[PDB]
Nucleic acid binder design. Structure first.
Length: 750
DNA sequence: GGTAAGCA
DNA sequence: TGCTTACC
């Protein structure tokens, strides 16, 4: 199977290399046959003989168009005649493009800034991570002797742990007596053993957690000072930093660096994204953290290292397990998109759709629209449309509730109303559907580019689901499940893609119309659910409704609910389908986007309320959860008021622990660009004053300390407490939190 | 990707 | 307001 691709300049000409892995043997495969090119649309096709002779320059030398062919393609469905300008080297494309645009007989030019190795994959129709191959995986993590004032790198690497399917060890240079620890002469020899372990194991994939930003760049700094070449690549080569977005990733030749941190952040939505937090949130069992302050003492003392070694071992072990679970999802995306895992694993869903289209656009002989210009991109940002409909809830406590939602609303709208730029407002098209409220016409004679592709996706997904039901072997059952999950992720990325400012196939009018149809079909079911079935729709948000027959018998509300979806689906066009999602014994609707329901088994789904927020104290979440609990389960509002008043005294007596006092707030900008200082900013601003590495995306916790003055300067880091203002955590957190529910019951501050 | 509730 | 985070 193909693991990666690249090119190298062999005496001025470009050579594609395919890093394969076939039946156990890893083998590089070269190719010199492939030619870089671009497209040029001419006003006068006779003026080709002039354009053929255009010439640029690069690093002193003179550059020209090696060849030219007249090809007929399509553009947004319509047939187009375009000339294919072949060059010699892919880095000639920037200079030639410029000079060809200037020409008056050239209208525009397309597919010019597509990386050369990616052309190869698309054009040759090759797909990474195909076929049956047992890839060797190896996770690893390091440990640094950090002091609070020290720069990045000055501290020695203390440990390097690595994990595997068979074993999981640690490598250090102090004397730790454990079966998994490996004692070594020095830092120098630690790094050396690591490199040997990598050569011995020979991993097809190297897994890490935060490798791109921390693990690898730290190694590099140390290996520089110790004069050691990090021979990690199969080419014998070192890890190379390669920019992909504004982000700077890390690359290893012949192997696949797989940083989990990127994939994780976009898959789930946890409070904090430390390795410890993520591990528990996936599997269940715990994993503690030993801080850099605690380890530095353990290094000087040299007696506490029994546990620090245990910590490092678990990081590698963790990373491997996490890695092992998140990989098949990511390798299936790579297989579906048709790009190397390394990129996919660091690629936004927007981009994933982009590349998916580019490939399919080739397969259909369609010329890809160009990226937006700087002005267009900016003019696209200052442009919007209305989104989903959200009903003001019928507030209060309600019995016997039902949830009904659409199966893949937006995909079904797209597919069945043929929504795409290549069908928008076509001239003299026979049949079309009009967009509600916004009035965009969509031709339905020939199925549009994107709609057509969603069809194939959902059809295949639909084929897998029926295959899973009917399959016997429980191995393929799991692999099927991953394919089907990947197609889902891609399938639901199209609506967002349409309004993505950097999108080649950006189509605001498409996005607007999908939304438009959404509201129509939801408001239909709404009016139809009450006026013809007697239900009372309590709340709505885009995709689904809550309903009930106020006072009615449980089993009747269910019986009629099933009947309503059986009737309404007959009224809905194409793929637009509604379903019976589930039943909830009670439900409490506070505001829009904020409510709680409780199933027949006793579990409570809380959405939007402080319970699931980061920027609220866990004492406020815990208290509020018990207030909800004691209202949803049964009317014990008497002890409910005692539950919260019991917490006021414990919070007053300083009897409540730390962590339950921590408030988390992400830093979304550079500290310089902040125009208004908050509490989480003032903490991270004074940390950076002591040389600490505060970057965007970093979620810090601030506990408020008892004093008097500004709320921001009184907040100290939550990671290290002071062995807090009781007025804040009561009157500005727990009380407001609990009030949100009890407000409807009429309670004041009591 | 738009809709929406909150804190000083 | 500036700001943050959740919802679909």
């Amino acid at each position: 199977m193909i693991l990666d691709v690249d090119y190298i300049t062999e005496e001025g000409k470009p050579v594609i290399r395919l890093f394969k892995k076939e039946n156990g043997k890893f083998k590089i495969e070269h190719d010199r046959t492939f030619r870089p090119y671009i497209y040029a649309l001419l006003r006068d096709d006779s003026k080709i003989e002039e354009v053929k002779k255009i010439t640029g320059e690069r690093h002193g030398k003179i550059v020209r168009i090696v060849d030219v062919e007249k090809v007929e393609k399509k553009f947004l469905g319509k047939p187009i005649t375009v000339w294919k300008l072949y060059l010699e080297h892919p880095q000639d494309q920037p200079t030639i493009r410029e000079k060809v645009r200037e020409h008056p007989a050239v209208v525009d030019i397309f597919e010019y800034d597509i990386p050369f190795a990616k052309r190869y994959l698309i054009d040759k129709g090759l797909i990474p991570m195909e076929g049956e191959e047992e890839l060797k995986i190896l996770a690893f993590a390091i440990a640094t002797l950090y002091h609070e004032g020290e720069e990045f790198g000055k501290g020695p690497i203390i440990m390097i742990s690595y994990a595997d399917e068979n074993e999981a060890k640690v490598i250090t240079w102090k004397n730790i007596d454990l079966p998994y620890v490996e004692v070594v002469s020095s830092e120098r020899e630690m790094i050396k053993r690591f490199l040997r372990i990598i050569r011995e194991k020979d991993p097809d994939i190297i897994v890490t957690y935060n490798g791109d930003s921390f693990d690898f760049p730290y190694l590099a700094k140390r290996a520089e000072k110790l004069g050691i070449k990090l021979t990690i690549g199969r080419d014998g080569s070192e890890p190379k930093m390669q920019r992909i977005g504004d982000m700077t990733a890390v690359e290893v030749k012949g192997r696949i660096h797989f940083d989990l941190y990127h994939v994780i952040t976009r898959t789930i939505n946890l409070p904090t994204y430390t390795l410890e937090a993520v591990y528990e949130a996936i599997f269940g069992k715990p994993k503690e953290k030993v801080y850099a302050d605690e380890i530095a003492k353990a290094w000087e003392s040299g007696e506490n290292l029994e546990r620090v070694a245990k910590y490092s071992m678990e990081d590698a072990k963790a990373t491997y397990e996490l890695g092992k679970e998140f990989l098949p999802m990511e390798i299936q995306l790579s297989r579906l998109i048709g790009q190397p895992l390394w990129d996919v694993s660091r690629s936004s869903t927007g981009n994933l759709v982009e590349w998916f289209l580019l490939r399919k656009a080739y397969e259909r002989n369609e010329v890809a629209p160009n990226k937006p210009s700087e002005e267009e991109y900016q003019r696209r940002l200052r442009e919007s449309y209305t989104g989903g409909f959200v009903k003001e809830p019928e507030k209060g406590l309600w019995d016997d509730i039902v949830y009904l939602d659409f199966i893949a609303l937006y995909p079904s709208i797209i597919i069945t109303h043929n929504v795409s730029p290549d069908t928008l407002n076509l001239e003299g098209c026979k049949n079309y559907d009009i967009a509600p409220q916004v009035g965009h016409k969509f031709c339905k004679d020939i199925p549009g580019f994107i709609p057509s592709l969603l069809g194939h996706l959902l059809e295949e997904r639909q084929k897998i689901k029926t295959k899973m039901k009917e399959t016997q072997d429980p191995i393929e059952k799991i692999l099927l499940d991953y394919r089907q999950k990947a197609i889902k992720l891609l399938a639901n990325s199209f609506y967002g893609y349409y309004g993505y400012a950097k999108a080649r196939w950006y189509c605001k009018e498409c996005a607007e119309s999908v939304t438009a149809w959404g509201r129509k079909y939801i408001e239909l079911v709404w009016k139809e659910l009450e006026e013809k079935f007697g239900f009372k729709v309590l709340y709505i948000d885009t995709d689904g409704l809550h309903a009930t027959i106020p006072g009615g018998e449980s089993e009747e509300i269910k019986k009629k609910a099933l009947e309503f979806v059986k009737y309404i689906n007959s009224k809905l066009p194409g793929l637009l389908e509604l379903e019976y999602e589930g039943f909830y014994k009670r439900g409490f609707f506070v505001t829009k986007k904020r409510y709680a329901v409780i199933d027949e088994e006793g579990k409570v789904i809380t959405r939007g309320l402080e319970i699931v927020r980061r920027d609220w104290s866990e004492i406020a979440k815990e208290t509020q959860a018990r207030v909800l609990e004691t209202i949803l389960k049964h009317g014990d509002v008497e002890e409910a008021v005692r539950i919260v008043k019991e917490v006021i005294q414990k919070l007053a007596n300083y009897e409540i622990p730390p962590e339950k006092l921590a408030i988390y707030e992400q830093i979304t900008r550079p500290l310089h660009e902040y125009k208004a200082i908050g509490p989480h900013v003032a903490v991270a601003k004074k940390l950076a004053a002591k040389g600490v590495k505060i970057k965007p995306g970093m979620v810090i916790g601030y506990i408020v300390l008892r004093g008097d003055g500004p709320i921001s300067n009184r907040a100290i880091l939550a990671e290290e407490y002071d062995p807090y203002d009781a007025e804040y955590y009561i009157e500005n957190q727990v009380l407001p939190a609990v009030l949100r529910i009890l407000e409807g019951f009429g309670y004041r501050k009591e």
